[PDB]
Swiss-Prot record, chain A:
PROSITE patterns: GLNA_1 (PS00180), GLNA_ATP (PS00181), GS_BETA_GRASP (PS51986), GS_CATALYTIC (PS51987). The modification Phosphotyrosine is found at Y103. Mn(2+) 1 binds at E133, H252, E337. This is Glutamine synthetase. It comes from Bos taurus (Bovine). The lineage of its organism: Eukaryota, Metazoa, Chordata, Craniata, Vertebrata.
UniProtKB/Swiss-Prot annotation, chain B:
This is Bestrophin-2. Ca(2+) binds at A9, Q292, N295, D300, D303. It catalyses: chloride(in) = chloride(out); iodide(out) = iodide(in); hydrogencarbonate(in) = hydrogencarbonate(out); L-glutamate(out) = L-glutamate(in). It comes from the Eukaryota. The chain holds residues 2 to 367 of 512 of the full protein. Belongs to the anion channel-forming bestrophin (TC 1.A.46) family. Calcium-sensitive chloride channel subfamily. Ligand-gated anion channel that allows the movement of anions across cell membranes when activated by calcium (Ca2+). Transports a large specter of anions, namely mediates the movement of chloride, L-glutamate and iodide. Calcium-binding triggers the dilation of the aperture, but calcium-dependent gating is only effective when the size of the passing anion is bigger than the closed aperture. Mediates the calcium-activated hydrogencarbonate movement and participates in colonic hydrogencarbonate secretion concomitant with mucin secretion.
Length: 371, 366
């Protein structure tokens, strides 16, 4: 069942969107709220099209309304971090992804980009590249997956993965609209597929260098939510939307450095993985917005997943925590895939943990300060 | 090129007369060698007549001087000089108008190829660099100075006009003809790609870009045409033979004869034929005008400054399409927003010349 807003005449809205807007420009400021997994937005009018992110003014909002502050000093600040073209309003309107700061200009608790950028600047010469496979499930407003029988289940899994046809793929209109919307916005979207669970989908973001991975994925998530809002359905990043023999949603992260991409870079890939072998618990905590409880429902070691309590790595191992692609093993260079991160992970937390363990050789149960 | 239009801004008492004191690109710098040669032969022949030749041979020599003076025709050579030099000047000016200039292209590109990002900037810069590269290729094909600046395509690559990959694409093409047109085809392909990608917003803008590209390319082709098709060699040889025949006639026919013979029109000997030297200046310089303008892309002082034009076009085009793209001062009211008349003031130096009744027509003074 789709939302009441989706039943409003879309024809009418278009007619208003066809009006020439004139000299004023709309900027939509996007930020992460106090849950560390929700996105918030609002719009301001600018006098002219900004040429770069530097021209965008800082803004503010009430943190007590976003689970981000309490009491008197609840005013929070928005500092623009990345700019994109607005696919919902078209050029010259912009999407402005912002960092959140408290009233005293300290980073907000869900502001993970502030530290993530400092870590990325530390290893800039090694040029870390990331890719994330964002899995998501389309849901009706009733909390049941989009397209599934009322209070019931479709046929067993098997035909839905990369499926085509009215009985195989549910809500491809949303997937096509999102893909185009991301390409128009300047998001580094690498592809899409239908997932094993019906009404479950995936888009790939990358390759992205350093802090660009978190910006591109967060804005790609925002566009998906905004596109799904137009169609009147919900995109969930819950790692296990439906209990039982229905696939979880993960965010598989591909990681490579300049050394790993160069000839005979497999030795550096293996060195990074054995470093990851010794910090499995540290990464599980970082790979989930609430410390790894959500990912416990997904990482059961059954549905092409690994076990949350046990670390494993191998070439072409779908069930392993870390997978080296078969081609990467043959070519002796390229990347490796971390399959642990949950679909509702913060990419700033995930990328920072990979750099700290693999590149800065950090150890122990707490992140190093100033290094 | 030698520019003196500042000197001749007004018709002064000594306006053109002081232009005879200039040296760079002057008649003297072009003629003094032929002048010394003509004077040397005239003086040697006069000295031989005065001293070496016998008295008996001197009568034959002076009869030959009279015979050669009778056929010294200065009027007919003026016609062939006037017509030939007018044709050469027509070709010279049309060749200047065919210089590959990218101002029209930069205006269209900055107004039609959009995007503040890296890709739009790459589009604008590469579109203007392609036109610059085709200009450099045709000019190094036609101009000696540009060829010495770009002796090889490697020099073009190091200059930044063409890249390594563009060089590989350029050399791999199988053609035995000059490839100055290749960057124009690249421009057309890049413009079509920009239109397909939405960088060019409207269909009219793409058409305007291809119209302006074909104007630029036709100018390059016209430079190639002028370089290939010389002034017909027979006509150049006709004018040279007429001038040299007249001067060979003047070398002997104007020889100073001994006044002792009492021949009419030859009863004086100034040992220097200054009026014949002035006629030499006149006719030899009139031929030298064509001799300098026949190929205006050489290294003459009055030849076109092709390297300067390449530098100016490249720098200005890059500035206009990159730093000036959508970089405008905010719209504000001018000094005459509320004024019925929009008139600027005059300085103290121009007011007393100006402030005169404005011309309305020939028929309004009845
Ligand atoms: Ca010349
Ligand atoms: Cl809004
Ligand atoms: Mn997948
Ligand atoms: Mn994968």
């Amino acid at each position: 069942a789709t939302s009441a807003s989706s039943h409003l005449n879309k024809g009418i809205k278009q007619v208003y969107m066809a009006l020439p807007q004139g000299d004023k420009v709309q900027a939509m400021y996007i930020w992460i709220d106090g849950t560390g997994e929700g996105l918030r937005c609002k719009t301001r009018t600018l006098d002219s099209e900004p040429k770069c992110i530097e021209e965008l003014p800082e803004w503010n909002f009430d943190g007590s309304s976003t689970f981000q502050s309490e009491g008197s000093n609840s005013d929070m600040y928005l500092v623009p971090a990345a700019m994109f073209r607005d696919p919902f309003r078209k050029d010259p309107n912009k999407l402005v992804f912002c960092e959140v700061f408290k009233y005293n200009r300290k980073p907000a608790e869900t502001n993970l980009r502030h530290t993530c950028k400092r870590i990325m600047d530390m290893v800039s010469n090694q040029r870390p590249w990331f890719g994330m496979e964002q899995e998501y499930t389309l849901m009706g407003t009733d909390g049941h997956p989009f397209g599934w029988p009322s209070n019931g289940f479709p046929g067993p899994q098997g035909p839905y993965y990369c499926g085509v046809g009215a009985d195989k793929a549910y809500g491809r209109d949303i997937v096509e609209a999102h893909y185009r919307a991301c390409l128009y916005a300047g998001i580094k979207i690498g592809g899409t597929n239908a997932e094993v669970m019906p009404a479950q989908w995936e888009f790939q973001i990358g390759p992205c260098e350093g802090i660009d991975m978190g910006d591109h994925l967060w804005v790609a998530r925002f566009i998906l939510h905004r596109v799904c809002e137009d169609f009147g359905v919900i995109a969930t990043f819950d790692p296990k939307p439906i209990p039982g023999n229905w696939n979880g949603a993960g965010c598989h992260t591909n990681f490579s450095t300049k050394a790993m991409r160069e000839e005979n870079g497999l030795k550096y890939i293996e060195e990074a993985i054995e470093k990851l072998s010794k910090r499995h618990q540290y990464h599980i905590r970082a790979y989930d917005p609430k410390g790894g409880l959500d990912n416990a429902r997904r990482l059961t070691g059954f549905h092409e997943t690994s076990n949350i309590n046990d670390f494993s790595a191998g070439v072409a191992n779908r069930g392993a925590s870390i997978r080296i692609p078969r081609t990467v093993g043959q070519e002796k260079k390229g990347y490796f895939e971390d399959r642990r991160p949950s679909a509702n992970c913060d990419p700033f937390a995930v990328t920072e943990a990979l750099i700290r363990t693999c590149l800065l050789n950090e150890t122990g149960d707490e992140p190093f300060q100033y290094k | 090129t030698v520019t003196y239009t500042a000197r001749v801004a007004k018709a002064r008492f000594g306006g053109f007369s002081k232009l005879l004191l200039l040296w760079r690109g002057s008649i003297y710098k072009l003629l003094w060698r032929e002048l010394l040669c003509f004077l040397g032969l005239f003086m040697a022949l006069s000295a031989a007549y005065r001293f070496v030749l016998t008295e008996e041979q001197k009568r034959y020599f002076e009869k030959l001087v009279l015979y050669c003076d009778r056929y010294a025709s200065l009027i007919p050579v003026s016609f062939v000089l006037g017509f030939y030099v007018t044709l050469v000047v027509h070709r010279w000016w049309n060749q200047y108008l065919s210089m590959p200039l990218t101002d029209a292209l930069m205006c269209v590109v900055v107004g039609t190829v959009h995007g503040h990002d890296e890709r739009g900037r790459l589009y604008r810069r590469t579109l203007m660099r392609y036109a610059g590269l085709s200009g450099v290729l045709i000019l190094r094909s036609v101009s000696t100075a540009v060829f010495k600046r770009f002796p090889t395509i490697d020099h073009v690559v190091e200059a930044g006009f063409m890249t390594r990959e563009e060089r590989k694409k350029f050399e791999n093409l199988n053609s035995s003809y000059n490839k100055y047109w290749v960057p124009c085809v690249w421009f057309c392909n890049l413009a079509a790609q920009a239109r397909r990608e939405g960088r060019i917003r409207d269909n009219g803008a793409f058409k305007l870009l291809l119209e302006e590209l074909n104007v630029f390319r036709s100018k390059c082709g016209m430079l190639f045409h002028y370089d290939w098709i010389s002034v017909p060699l027979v006509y150049t040889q006709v004018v040279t033979i007429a001038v040299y025949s007249y001067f060979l006639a003047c070398l002997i026919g104007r020889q100073f004869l001994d006044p002792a013979q009492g021949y009419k029109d030859h009863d004086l000997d100034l040992c220097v034929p200054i009026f014949t030297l002035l006629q030499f200046f006149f006719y030899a310089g009139w031929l030298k005008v064509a001799e300098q303008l026949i190929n205006p892309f050489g290294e003459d002082d009055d030849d076109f400054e092709t390297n300067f034009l390449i530098d100016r076009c490249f720098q200005v085009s890059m500035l206009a399409v990159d730093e000036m793209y959508d970089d405008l001062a905010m719209l504000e009211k001018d000094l005459y927003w509320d004024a019925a008349e929009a008139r600027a003031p005059y300085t103290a130096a121009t007011a007393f010349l100006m402030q005169q009744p404005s011309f309305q027509g020939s028929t309004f003074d009845i």
